[PDB]
Curated annotation (Swiss-Prot):
Stretches in topological domain Extracellular: 1-36, 97-110, 174-202, 275-286
InterPro entries linked to this entry: GPCR_opsins (IPR050125), GPCR_Rhodpsn (IPR000276), GPCR_Rhodpsn_7TM (IPR017452), Opsin (IPR001760), Retinal_BS (IPR027430), Rhodopsin (IPR000732), Rhodopsin_N (IPR019477)
Modified residues (N6-(retinylidene)lysine): K296
Name of the molecule in the record: Rhodopsin
Cystine connections: C110-C187
Record site: Plays an important role in the conformation switch to the active conformation: E113
Keywords attached to this entry: Acetylation, Cell projection, Chromophore, Disulfide bond, G-protein coupled receptor, Glycoprotein, Lipoprotein, Membrane, Metal-binding, Palmitate, Phosphoprotein, Photoreceptor protein, Receptor, Retinal protein, Sensory transduction, Transducer, Transmembrane, Transmembrane helix, Vision, Zinc
Membrane topology: Multi-pass membrane protein
Family: Belongs to the G-protein coupled receptor 1 family. Opsin subfamily.
Motif 'Ionic lock' involved in activated form stabilization mapped to chain: 134-136
Consequence of substituting N2C: Stabilized by a disulfide bond and normal light absorption
Cytoplasmic-side segments: 62-73, 134-152, 225-252
Length: 326
């Protein structure tokens, strides 16, 4: 027996020596050394110090530069906002709790922190999906006489909001639940205890299919077709070096974006799928925080890839940071 059950939690540590306390009431220093809790805090600090400026600057630069405010870019603003939900909902609260050694805000705080942290990263997830769809629609022109504009861009943003709520809300009202995870300082969806009262098994399948496989297929399809269309168009215009450049640049960025998507969610899903097969095993507190490393860090590397590697934004950023010139 490798864990310790309670009303609103599951501490991954045997209580056979009697040392296990609630993650809402007392420090979990039997679960991990105090210095490891400090390193958790150190990492949350890094994610905030990098994550806030990068994502805030994205919104600020867009307000100052008319050229950035195009319908396509609406979703990349949505991304930046989602990343800020991850920072202020997730990382800051985890920084606070990690320094105590347990989730001080209790079960209600666990639901809040879990909701906004889940909502944040899920909006970001679907933002990356909707961008691929919009880019696919715009480049491949799969529809007869269609023009992407403000109305469509806003629907795409609302679509992410809805999908993210379809993921984050149900645990608040019966279907699965939010409980402290890993080192017990941050809360999230329960996918490591078969909890019949909330039906965790169905929700995990629903999550795996609707919120990972479907996104993964849409992203691979949309960008697959986009790279196909661009490559055959360049092959029919090989005299233009500009077009050959643009073709290679687009293919390079698609590979970066697809690989980046996998790094973010494949570890989180690979571990989730493993627990579905091998249930109730001796999963450490650190083991649970390894997938969350890659996922939470996306709040920094997504805006680096999807926004700061754009030459247009990069100029506006320099201008805004240098007060007007340069
Ligand atoms: C992990 O295991 C440990 C060990 O079992 C466990 O901690 C223990 O919890 C029990 C309560 O569940 C504690 O027992 C209490 O001891 C105090 C003595 O001061 C009593 O006052 C408590 O109440 C009794 O007496 C009252 C008298 O008026 C009655 O009103 C009441 O009904 C009770 O009879 C109670 O006996 C025990 O002290 C700890 N032990 C240790 C070592 O901490 C812990 O709960 C487990 N963790 C999890 C998450 O499940
Ligand atoms: C940068 C944000 C500030 C975080 C302040 C952390 C306060 C930690 O407070 C600690 O909690 C222990 C219980 O776990 C108690 O022994 C004491 O209150 C204190 O040592
Ligand atoms: C990915 C599909 C497999 C099942 C996933 C279920 C667990 C979801 O886990 C969630 O991930 C979010 C990442 O955005 C974190 O912010 C949340 O804290 C966490 O609850
Ligand atoms: C979703 C997957 C995105 C499309 C990835 C295609 C990358 C293939 O690679 C591309 O074409 C040639 C090989 O086919 C290489 O020699 C080129 O360097 C490269 O641009
Ligand atoms: C335009 O005039 C150029 C920008 C002016 C600012 C140049 C100085 C940048 C230094 C940033 C250092 C970051 C410190 C990070 C420590 C945590
Ligand atoms: C806007 O007008 C661009 C200039 C603004 C920067 C003024 C000079 C910056 C000096 C660099 C100091 C960096 C130290 C960071 C402290 C942690």
């Amino acid at each position: 027996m490798n864990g310790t059950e309670g009303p609103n939690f599951y501490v991954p540590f045997s209580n056979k020596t009697g040392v296990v306390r609630s993650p809402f009431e007392a420090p979990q220093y039997y679960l991990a050394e105090p210095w490891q809790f400090s390193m958790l805090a150190a990492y949350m600090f890094l994610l905030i110090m990098l994550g806030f400026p990068i994502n805030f600057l994205t919104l600020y630069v867009t307000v100052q530069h008319k050229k950035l405010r195009t319908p396509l870019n609406y979703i990349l603003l949505n991304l930046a906002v989602a990343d800020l939900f991850m920072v202020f909902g997730g990382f800051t609260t985890t920084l606070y709790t990690s320094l105590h050694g347990y989730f001080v805000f209790g079960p209600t705080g666990c639901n809040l922190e879990g909701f906004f942290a889940t909502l944040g990263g899920e909006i970001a997830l679907w933002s990356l999906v909707v961008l691929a769809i919009e880019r696919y629609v715009v480049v491949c022109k799969p529809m007869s006489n269609f023009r992407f504009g403000e109305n469509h861009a806003i629907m795409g943003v609302a679509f992410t909001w809805v999908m993210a709520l379809a993921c984050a809300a149900p645990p608040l009202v019966g279907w699965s639940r939010y409980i402290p995870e890993g080192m017990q300082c941050s809360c999230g969806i329960d996918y490591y205890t078969p909890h019949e009262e909330t039906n965790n098994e169905s929700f995990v399948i629903y999550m795996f299919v609707v919120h990972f496989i479907i996104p993964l297929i849409v992203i691979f399809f949309c960008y697959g077709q986009l790279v196909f269309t661009v490559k055959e168009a360049a092959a029919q215009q090989q005299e233009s070096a500009t077009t050959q450049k643009a073709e290679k640049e687009v293919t390079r960025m698609v590979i970066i974006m697809v690989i980046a998507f996998l790094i973010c969610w494949l570890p989180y899903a690979g571990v989730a799928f493993y627990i579905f097969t091998h249930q109730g095993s001796d999963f450490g507190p650190i083991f649970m925080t390894i997938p969350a490393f890659f996922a939470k860090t996306s709040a920094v590397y997504n805006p680096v890839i999807y926004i700061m590697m754009n030459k247009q934004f990069r100029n506006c950023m320099v201008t805004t940071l240098c007060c007007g010139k340069n």
